[PDB]
Ligand binder design. Structure first.
Ligand SMILES: [Fe+3]
Length: 54
């Protein structure tokens, strides 16, 4: 389960962690995060995120 980064501000989504405050529980892979979700720091959509190929 891979991490994703917001390319506009650097936030990193960690599927272990999730984004619970926004309704994205731990263990939610990026692709299953509802498509209306936006970066918690900067507010941008998911289409500015990239998978962290480390
Ligand atoms: Fe961001």
């Amino acid at each position: 389960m891979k991490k994703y980064t917001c390319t506009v501000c650097g936030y990193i989504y960690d599927p272990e962690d999730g984004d619970p405050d926004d309704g994205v529980n731990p263990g939610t892979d990026f692709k299953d995060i509802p498509d209306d979700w936006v970066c918690p720091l900067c507010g941008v959509g998911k289409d500015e995120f990239e998978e962290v190929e480390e």
